[PDB]
Amino acid sequence: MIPGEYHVKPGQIALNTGRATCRVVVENHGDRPIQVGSHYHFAEVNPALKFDRQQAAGYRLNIPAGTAVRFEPGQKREVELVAFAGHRAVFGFRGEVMGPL
Amino acid sequence: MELTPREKDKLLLFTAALVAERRLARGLKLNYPESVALISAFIMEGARDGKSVASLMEEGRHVLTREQVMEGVPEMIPDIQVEATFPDGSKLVTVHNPII
Amino acid sequence: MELTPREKDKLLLFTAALVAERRLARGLKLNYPESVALISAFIMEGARDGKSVASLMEEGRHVLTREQVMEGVPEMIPDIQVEATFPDGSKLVTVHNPII
Amino acid sequence: SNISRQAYADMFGPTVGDKVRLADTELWIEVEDDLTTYGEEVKFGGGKVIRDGMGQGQMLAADCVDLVLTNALIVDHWGIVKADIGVKDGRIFAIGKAGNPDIQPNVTIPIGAATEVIAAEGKIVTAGGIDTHIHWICPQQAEEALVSGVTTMVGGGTGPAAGTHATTCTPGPWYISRMLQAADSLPVNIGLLGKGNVSQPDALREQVAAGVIGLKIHEDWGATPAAIDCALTVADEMDIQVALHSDTLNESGFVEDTLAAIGGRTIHTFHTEGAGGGHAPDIITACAHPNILPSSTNPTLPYTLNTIDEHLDMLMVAHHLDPDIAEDVAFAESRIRRETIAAEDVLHDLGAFSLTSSDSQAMGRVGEVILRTWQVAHRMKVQRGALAEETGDNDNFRVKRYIAKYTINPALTHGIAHEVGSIEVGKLADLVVWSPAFFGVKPATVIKGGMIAIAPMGDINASIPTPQPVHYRPMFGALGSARHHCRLTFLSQAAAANGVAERLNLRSAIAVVKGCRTVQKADMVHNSLQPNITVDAQTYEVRVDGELITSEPADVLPMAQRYFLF
Amino acid sequence: SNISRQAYADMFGPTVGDKVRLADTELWIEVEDDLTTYGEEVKFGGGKVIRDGMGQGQMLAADCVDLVLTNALIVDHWGIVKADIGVKDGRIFAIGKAGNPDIQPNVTIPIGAATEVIAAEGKIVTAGGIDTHIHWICPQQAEEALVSGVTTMVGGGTGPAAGTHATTCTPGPWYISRMLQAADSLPVNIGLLGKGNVSQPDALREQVAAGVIGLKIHEDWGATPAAIDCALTVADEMDIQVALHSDTLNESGFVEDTLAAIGGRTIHTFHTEGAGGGHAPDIITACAHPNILPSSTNPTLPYTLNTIDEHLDMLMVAHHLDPDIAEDVAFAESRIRRETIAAEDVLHDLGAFSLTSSDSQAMGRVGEVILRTWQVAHRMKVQRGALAEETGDNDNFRVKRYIAKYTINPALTHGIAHEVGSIEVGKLADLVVWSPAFFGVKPATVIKGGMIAIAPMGDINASIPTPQPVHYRPMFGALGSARHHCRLTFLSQAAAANGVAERLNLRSAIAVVKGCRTVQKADMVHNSLQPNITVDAQTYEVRVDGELITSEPADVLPMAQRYFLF
Amino acid sequence: SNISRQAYADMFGPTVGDKVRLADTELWIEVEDDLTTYGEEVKFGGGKVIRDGMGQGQMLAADCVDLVLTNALIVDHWGIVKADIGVKDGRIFAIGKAGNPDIQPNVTIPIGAATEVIAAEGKIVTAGGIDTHIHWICPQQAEEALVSGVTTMVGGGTGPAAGTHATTCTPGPWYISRMLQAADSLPVNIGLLGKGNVSQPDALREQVAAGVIGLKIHEDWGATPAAIDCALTVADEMDIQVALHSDTLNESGFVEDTLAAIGGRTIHTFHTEGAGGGHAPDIITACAHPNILPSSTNPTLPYTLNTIDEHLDMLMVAHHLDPDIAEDVAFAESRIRRETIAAEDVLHDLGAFSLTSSDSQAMGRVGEVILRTWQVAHRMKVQRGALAEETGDNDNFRVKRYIAKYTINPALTHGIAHEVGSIEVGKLADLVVWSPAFFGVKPATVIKGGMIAIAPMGDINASIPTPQPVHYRPMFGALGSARHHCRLTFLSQAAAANGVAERLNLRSAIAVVKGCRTVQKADMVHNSLQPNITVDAQTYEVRVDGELITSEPADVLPMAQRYFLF
Ligand code: NI
Ligand code: NI
Ligand code: NI
Ligand code: NI
Ligand code: NI
Ligand code: NI
């Protein structure tokens, strides 16, 4: 007996199903580490991360909500992106879009 | 004495620990509040003695064992935190999984 | 610990009893507040041990005798009542004419 | 991508199909539904989801909620579901999916710059409890009840006076006015009960016009057929509720005479089992009638090994009885019956008794209404097994039946269900957040009208809020003008119209009671059973349809020694 | 039928001829009269008398009292009688026989639906005490005094500042306004004293117009003939009282010079014995004059074995004196005289000293005014026997003489006797209920303006209000708006007319002082003696008509170690 | 006549040339000037100077001060001088020579009948502290800070909610209104910060119009270039301040990108060292810019042996990070650097960092802002010796540089220096009196708006205020209406004009912020250094002009175990 214990049924949860995704190779050319959140508009991340910013337009990381991907200086890796939904309007970040798309 | 609110608040913790201390002495298995108070009071005295935060983070995991507390209690206490005046001022001691 | 108001209130009773306990130990005849606190604290520990209400209603009358308290005190305490968490929840213990 | 169910539960709390143990009881609840879109859950913190342009939008205050409780596991009479809860203007705005419509799908609860966040992942959220049997013996009772998870208190009293020690009555206009003014200082919603024991209607109408939302008929003031009829007549014309504590002495008649005096009119019967007062030994038979809304006070819940022993002296002090007067001790004993005390627990499990209450400091414990209700549920599952209504391998239905006893049913009974009583849109945001290990015992957060009013708080000078000692302390929702704005003082329709709030210069928000005469047993959520119940005059045995109703006394209970210091 | 006297006493409290011991002292009171009709006493509880159609009538709120204290044993300056007390609109309605005129005879206090009940059988009820020597060093003093049975506090101060530590003065309009506003937060009636030490009349008139009900002349601010004359001139024109602490140093003149400066005008002399301040060593001779209303502060009451020893260092801290400065220690010593300390106790017994007060935290104990007054009475009975005025085998007269010292006399002295000071019809219902075993030490209930403000209260979560721990806690009468309605802020006639209450937006009820200039020694109830008293300049021996006045120091006192935890 | 210097110091406190040790540190201050006329010092007490016609004059209230602090040793950014302080209408009237012009020379502070006296001889008097980094997690923080000597608290929050646990933000109009109302109940001056993280200007303008005096940009809500630019644009048009907690993750850019986004506009950078949040690992380089007003939070002050060890778990709880999530622990570790923690202490000593604050219960200790500031000064004197600016054999300059960090500089940074922040004529009389042995640790008296609000107080029932137990208790300045009159609620110019105070019915005095956009680093008193500072990306080494900046960790500190019970 453990007070308030969970009895989680075994299995897995499929995240962001039925949505467009794409893979992109990213490389940190800066001398300081960069960490990106699950819902940040990838096309507007720190300029030191080199990748096809055009392909990442309207996309965010396809990872569980609230988690992140870290890039140490010089680190190169391939990440999977998932398209934004809702109104597909991007406001904020580095102020590159500030509107629909 | 000019006791500030925080000093008086800690007197409440000290007293709660006296209660637990006497019960443990009788051979009773401690419950949730008694366990938290006993381990916390232990740390506060460690700081008064001049022990380091690092030493206490370790020693605090050896005050009570799973056989001295009620069932489920160890799981109700994933960690214990308490602050006290060390020789170098107030510091926070965090003891992870204190009861095993 | 997440102490509720009632738990903190009982800490006041426990502490008052510590005062009386030390004085009785010195051989002093206890006064009105000291007697009430000592017997009350005794009952609370009885409940923590798991004693029944019926047992405590009886045992509580044997904590202090007329020769251990000041004159008039036994008459100032026709009964003592205190509640504590028994294994089966909160229960009220009423001890009639505790001092004889 | 993909994530395992366990890892998922650790981050966002349980989802559909997962079960959770309620504290240290044998009751398990299973998540029935989850209103989220997997992958789009909102989480707050360093580098999380609720950030500008991401989980937080660009809308103005008018178009977003003031507060959002993220990933909450709701337990209410209507369901046990996982969802986000939005609060706007101190009221429940929506139960659904929170976030930013600009980039997220299915958002029904918009988060903007004006939105505060309470992380509820891994926590259970319920409506604030409603105790309708309060004796205003001291103001300290309010903090005790609030800490336990009770946000509304209905009762009567003027302080530690003999009349109040024994009855839930605030006698007359002067005292009623005084107590309505004092109520502004308390962090709970309050409604008052006046003294209903009079055979002159105008003496009752004055009290209702002064502000009471109900009338208490108590035997200590004379629970005679004439007084009962008078109170009900006035209640019928002013839309207020009547609470009854019948003639234990059978002085004016037996239970059938009292029932006849009531004449099918709506009435709330206090401590229907009888130990707290009522026709000896069959007052419990009242739960068979359609016009009776029956409740229990808490010291007899549940039946345990020490129950009987503690009752005699408790009875005496509560009613100013003299143990040296034979007639006084004989009538105290006729109220304490093992037979009816044991049957009461089963009647609750069957839905024959619809409410639980305290009877604060007058044969009841103000901080144990919720706690004892769950202990009864536990003891009943242990003894009787699953209810006939259960579906699946969980105790979801039993949980919904019992939570209704101290939430929606007391609200319906007293005509305040339009304001409080459950987590439904439009109702006051009185919410209680619980950690599963402490469900029903010690809350993590108590919210009143959209503001946190009390919560466990560690060392004030600490670097974080968690260091010891951690104990309950009043928060901003319990302070001065903020408190007034987050609490409600219930008035009768007549008092509201007479301008009582303006006259007394009441500072808190005002709410009016209504629908007290139209509620009946059939309206009690999950607790509408009208059993063919009988009590043997000699043996006191309780029978329903001829079958004997009884239960066994507990030697040990959950939600007890594992959580309390004393 | 018939009932034995003992059984009767156990049910309704004592009656005519029965005697009761006051706490653990040697003082016994005998019931002088009983206003009841045997067989018709009202008692509340399960199956008792106060019930619909029985002891409770059918009248509307306007025709019955709000509160009734049943079977009370009243102890007041006018008598020691058994009776019911009715309270209506926060004031004393009547002292007589309560009940229902419909079926009971001789009912003068009607009980109806609007009536709350406080059971006083077996209890002693007195008026709330009045301490006229308060140093507002901290707000916590109010709760301490209220708990002791004191409901009105008159004094001055601004908090823990040097000026207030030493004197009862609230200096100027700004501080006076601020303290009048702060007073609304305290559960006692309050009146303030301004700084009267100035030789410019307008500087005094401003303070009176701002709100003070009196002016304190203190030697620390210069108690010179010029300052004294100025204060008295203004007092004479604005109907306010002057309190004096004379020139101990004899710097401007001797006691005869100060008396000459007073010039037969009414004045209240603080701590007339001298230890608390005043012409050394003969300030005590002031009690011989008709215009002097003399009081004692409490640390010298009564003369005990440890009295002298504790005084020196107490004196030093209270007056900011330097123990290293010879002149400072010499003047401290000239104030402490065994001779005058011993005589003071006898002068109280003779009625030469008319009031007792504290001198809170400035050479006095705020919670011990009542307690010490009774200890003096006890020590005097023990040493001197019965007073010449005693009739019967009881101490009734001595009790009436002493209770007047902290109730009606302080009220008369300060012009507030029209509102408080005794249990008489029309006065504010400030009452204190005591259990005989704890009389004068720990009250059972303290009522302010008709509402209980503080009382001993047990475990808040308990099934009854009696379980331990039992300690004093604030009740509804001490909460927000209810408090404002149950307390009084006394103002000068000028302030009242100037609209000070409206300007500062004071929330409490307002009362105005009057008749401060017309009271004289002959008006002090049971304490109007003007003895031909002399003090020997060399030996300090006090003599009245040539006979030496003195007493012996107590080694042990009642109302001490038997009741307190520390 | 003549008097020796030691005897003089014992009676009136030290004078020109005398030195005093600050608590148990190695810091010594030397009296720079004395505004008295030897022989004419005012002293209060039995037979002292402040008496009618002597040190007290005949003037009306309008021509004298309400309060005078006699013989005070002032320690402020402008000087360390001996003088009397006069307070009138809740504000600082004058710093000079008090007394009666009728008989005394050079009197600039007239004492009359309306004057209260606080004896400050032998005590040090300073302005009340100002903490600009408050997380309103619980109301109890106000008493803790006040007791420490802090009289103004600026921050944001709604209680113990996740958003507030992590950020100093009061989200939106509803919560802002609620917190402004709750503020009337707290005994400190208060100003609120709204959530500045939005890319829609109107969502910010609404909050400013509702009452906030600043906007907090926090990474937990998204500290992106777009959000930063938006907040600064609104700040520039509404004259409010912006507080920044930058993007630690370097997610949107590096420190140079954030600085570019700021674009030379005025901004207050919170915990500039970085442990409390900010671009890893070089956020500390911000102190080089003219538009940046940099502050430190207190757990990293000063660098000690246990500092690093306690930080990791503190970080986690404060930001709702998961220790099981690798990315969460990696970003927590990147914030804790021995290199920047050690350099911070030196940067304070050099005047590169201009303010100290707490970061209450979110990686900071609310009652230790003052205490830790002095511990840094001590550790710096011990390690680096005298500052280049020092003159004489004392630490006067270092003391002025450090006191400015928690008094005048926070006031200038937030646009409230016209009301509080220093002991200058016309400013609110928020003063703190200290005994030299307890300087910076435990105050003797805390004055708010001219009234004592909290102070150590002994046994309430004692004969004097000094007997044990002595602990801090609320005084009259903290009570109801008196409190409202002695505290300030700061509003934005827009809110003031919109009538927010009238709408919410705020009871306290209102003050408006102004000059938040025009302050720059050059305006920080004694702390205007703009060093050419660099941080090595790999080693984290801090260098100024190429030289390495560092210090050694303390094993023992003053103002620690000698004063606290726990
Ligand atoms: Ni009842
Ligand atoms: Ni009841
Ligand atoms: Ni005096
Ligand atoms: Ni005095
Ligand atoms: Ni921060
Ligand atoms: Ni912060």
For residues D350 and D360, is the Cβ–Cβ distance under 8 A?
no
Shortest distance, CA C61 to any CA of chain E (angstroms)? 16
Residue E543's SS3 state is: strand
> Cβ of D166 and E481 within 8 Å?
no
Rounded CA Rg of chain A: 16
Residue E481's SS3 state is: helix
Q: What angle do CA E447, E449, E452 make, to 5 degrees?
A: 30
Cis before F302? omega within 30: yes
Q: Is F248 exposed, middle or buried (0-12, 13-18, 19+ CB in 10 A)?
A: buried
The Å distance, Cα D51 to ligand 6 centre, comes to 17
Q: Is A49 on the interface with F (CB under 8 A)?
A: no
Sort out which chain D residues have CB atoms less than 8 A from B72's CB and list them.
Answer: 24, 437, 562
Residue with tokens 């005949």: F58
Check whether F77 is labelled as a binding-site residue. no
Shortest distance, CA D320 to any CA of chain E (angstroms)? 5
**3 state SS for F433-454:** EECHHHCCCCCCEEEECCEEEE
Q: Among D77, D268, D311, D319, which one carries the catalytic annotation?
A: D319
For residues D188 and D218, is the Cβ–Cβ distance under 8 A?
no
Residue E218's SS3 state is: strand
Shortest distance, CA D69 to any CA of chain F (angstroms)? 10
Total Cβ atoms within 10 A of residue D505: 11
CA-nearest residue to D435 within chain B is: B76
- Secondary structure E strands in D160-203: 189-195
Q: What is the crossing angle of helices F225-238 and F201-210, to 10°? A: 40
Amino acid (1-letter code) at residue D182? A
The sign of the CA dihedral D463, D467, D468, D470 is: positive
**DSSP code of residue D458:** -
The dihedrals phi and psi of F432, each to the nearest 5 degrees, come to -130, 125
End-to-end Cα distance, chain F: 50
The sign of the CA dihedral B26, B28, B34, B39 is: positive
CA distances from D457 to D444, D469, D564, F315 (A): 10, 8, 17, 18
Cα–Cα distance for residue pair D270/E104, rounded to 1 Å: 32
Cα–chain center distance at E421: 8
Total Cβ atoms within 10 A of residue A53: 15
> Cβ of E139 and F52 within 8 Å?
no
Sort out which chain D residues have CB atoms less than 8 A from E471's CB and list them.
Answer: none
Strands E91-96 and E79-88 come out as: antiparallel
Shortest distance, CA C21 to any CA of chain D (angstroms)? 19
> Cβ of F116 and E164 within 8 Å?
yes
Name which of D242, D255, D250, D239 is nearest D287 in CA terms: D255
> Cβ of A48 and F254 within 8 Å?
yes
For residues F357 and F297, is the Cβ–Cβ distance under 8 A?
yes
Name which of E492, E488, E414 is nearest E208 in CA terms: E492
Shortest distance, CA A64 to any CA of chain D (angstroms)? 6
Q: Residue E462 is nearest to which of D185, D204, D365, comparing CB atoms? A: D365
Nearest ligand atom owner, CA of D268: 1
Q: State the DSSP string of D353-389.
A: S-EE---TTSSS-TT-HHHHHHHHHHHHHHHH-S-TT
Check whether F359 is labelled as a binding-site residue. yes
Numbered residues of the known binding site of E for substrate = 218
Sort out which chain D residues have CB atoms less than 8 A from C8's CB and list them.
Answer: 471
Name which of D465, D462, D467 is nearest D475 in CA terms: D465
Task: Quote the domain boundaries for residue A29.
Answer: 1-101
Amino acid (1-letter code) at residue E504? L
Name the residue ranges covered by the structural domains of chain D: 1-127+422-479, 128-421+480-565
Cα–Cα distance for residue pair E333/E316, rounded to 1 Å: 10
Sort out which chain B residues have CB atoms less than 8 A from D461's CB and list them.
Answer: 5-6, 83, 90
Residue D110's SS3 state is: strand
Total Cβ atoms within 10 A of residue F444: 19
Q: How many residues does chain B have?
A: 100
Name which of F250, D7, D57, D3 is nearest A62 in CA terms: D3
The Å distance, Cα F276 to ligand 6 centre, comes to 7
Sort out which chain D residues have CB atoms less than 8 A from E88's CB and list them.
Answer: 174
Q: Which residues pair with F40 in a beta bridge?
A: none
For residues F187 and F478, is the Cβ–Cβ distance under 8 A?
yes
Sort out which chain A residues have CB atoms less than 8 A from F534's CB and list them.
Answer: none
Neighbours of chain E (3+ CB pairs under 8 A): C, D, F
Q: Which residues of E are catalytic?
A: 319
Q: State the DSSP string of F285-313.
A: GGGGSTTEEEEE-STTSS-BTTHHHHHHH
Question: A101: which 2 tokens?
Answer: 């798309």
CA-nearest residue to A67 within chain D is: D48
The dihedrals phi and psi of D141, each to the nearest 5 degrees, come to -60, -35
Check whether F216 is labelled as a binding-site residue. yes
Q: Please report which helix (H) or strand (E) contains residue D317, including its range.
A: helix D307-318
**F418-431 exposure pattern, b = at least 16 Cβ within 10 A, e = fewer:** bbbbbbeeebbbbb
Which CATH number does the domain housing residue A9 bear?
2.10.150.10
- Ligand 2 ion: nearby residues, β-carbon < 5 Å: D 359, 362
**Angstrom resolution of this structure:** 2.0
Residue B18's SS3 state is: helix
CA-nearest residue to F456 within chain B is: B2
Sort out which chain A residues have CB atoms less than 8 A from B75's CB and list them.
Answer: 2-3, 5
Question: F395: which 2 tokens?
Answer: 């630490």
Cα–Cα distance for residue pair D14/A43, rounded to 1 Å: 33
> Cβ of A1 and B75 within 8 Å?
no
Amino acid (1-letter code) at residue F546? G
For residues D73 and D33, is the Cβ–Cβ distance under 8 A?
no
> Cβ of A94 and F225 within 8 Å?
yes
Which experimental technique did the depositors report for determining this structure? X-ray
Residues in CB range of F547: below 8 A, 6 or more apart: none
Which of D468, D471, D559 to mutate: most B Cβ within 10 Å? D468
Cα–Cα distance for residue pair E275/E121, rounded to 1 Å: 42
Question: E486: which 2 tokens?
Answer: 């149950």
CA-nearest residue to D486 within chain F is: F178
Residue with tokens 């946000």: D151
Q: State the DSSP string of F317-377.
A: HHTT--TTSHHHHHHHHTT--HHHHHHHHHHHHHTSS-EE---TTSSS-TT-HHHHHHHHH
**DSSP code of residue A9:** P
Q: State the DSSP string of D403-436.
A: HGGGTHHHHHHTT-TTTSSSS-TTSB--EEEE-G
Q: Which residues of F are catalytic?
A: 319
Shortest distance, CA C43 to any CA of chain B (angstroms)? 14
Name which of D487, E45, D250, E91 is nearest F178 in CA terms: D487
CA-nearest residue to A5 within chain B is: B75
Residue E348's SS3 state is: helix
> Cβ of B3 and F469 within 8 Å?
yes
Question: D355: which 2 tokens?
Answer: 């409410």
Q: Which residues pair with D195 in a beta bridge?
A: D216
CA-nearest residue to D365 within chain C is: C90
Q: Please report which helix (H) or strand (E) contains residue E244, including its range.
A: strand E241-245
Which of B2, B45, B57, B58 to mutate: most F Cβ within 10 Å? B2
Nearest ligand atom owner, CA of F137: 6
Residues in CB range of F2: below 8 A, 6 or more apart: none
Q: Which residue ranges form the domains of chain C, and what is each CATH number?
A: 1-100 (3.30.280.10)
Architecture of domain F128-421+480-565: Alpha-Beta Barrel (3.20)
> Cβ of B83 and D563 within 8 Å?
no
Q: Residue D200 is nearest to which of E10, E58, E475, comparing CB atoms? A: E58
Sort out which chain F residues have CB atoms less than 8 A from B44's CB and list them.
Answer: 566
E1-127+422-479 is classed CATH 2.30.40.10:
yes
Cα–chain center distance at F176: 23
The dihedrals phi and psi of F148, each to the nearest 5 degrees, come to -80, -15
Q: Is A93 on the interface with D (CB under 8 A)?
A: yes
Cis before A100? omega within 30: no
Residue with tokens 């959950």: D558
Cα–Cα distance for residue pair B2/F442, rounded to 1 Å: 7
Residues in CB range of E325: below 8 A, 6 or more apart: none
For residues E248 and E271, is the Cβ–Cβ distance under 8 A?
no
Cα–Cα distance for residue pair D316/E129, rounded to 1 Å: 34
Q: Which residues pair with E194 in a beta bridge?
A: E215
> Cβ of F253 and A68 within 8 Å?
no
The total of structural domains in chain A comes to 1
For residues F199 and F226, is the Cβ–Cβ distance under 8 A?
yes
Strands D150-156 and D129-135 come out as: parallel
Nearest ligand atom owner, CA of F363: 6
Check whether D393 is labelled as a binding-site residue. no
Cα–Cα distance for residue pair D502/D161, rounded to 1 Å: 28
Amino acid (1-letter code) at residue E415? G
Neighbours of chain B (3+ CB pairs under 8 A): A, C, D, F
Total Cβ atoms within 10 A of residue E132: 30
Question: D35: which 2 tokens?
Answer: 């209103």
Residue with tokens 């439009």: D426
Cα–Cα distance for residue pair E467/F273, rounded to 1 Å: 55
Q: Is E22 exposed, middle or buried (0-12, 13-18, 19+ CB in 10 A)?
A: buried
Nearest ligand atom owner, CA of D276: 1
**E47-72 exposure pattern, b = at least 16 Cβ within 10 A, e = fewer:** bbbbbbbbbbbbbbbeebbbbbbbbb
> Cβ of D461 and F365 within 8 Å?
yes
Q: Residue D115 is nearest to which of F164, F166, F172, comparing CB atoms? A: F172
- Contacts of D329-337 with CB under 8 Å at 24 or more apart are D331/D248, D331/D249, D331/D280, D331/E46, D331/E47, D334/D248, D334/D280, D334/D281, D335/D248, D335/D274, D335/D275, D335/D276, D335/D277, D335/D278, D335/D280, D336/D275, D336/D308, D336/D311, D336/D312, D337/D274, D337/D275, D337/D281, D337/D540
Sort out which chain E residues have CB atoms less than 8 A from C95's CB and list them.
Answer: none
> Cβ of D39 and A8 within 8 Å?
no
For residues D144 and C6, is the Cβ–Cβ distance under 8 A?
yes
Say how many CB pairs under 8 Å bridge D and F.
202
Max intra-chain CA distance, chain D = 78
Nearest ligand atom owner, CA of D155: 2
Cα–Cα distance for residue pair D211/D173, rounded to 1 Å: 8
Residue E379, phi-psi category: left (phi > 0), alpha (psi -120 to 50), beta (remainder): alpha
The Å distance, Cα F278 to ligand 6 centre, comes to 11
Total Cβ atoms within 10 A of residue C100: 9
For residues F416 and F152, is the Cβ–Cβ distance under 8 A?
yes
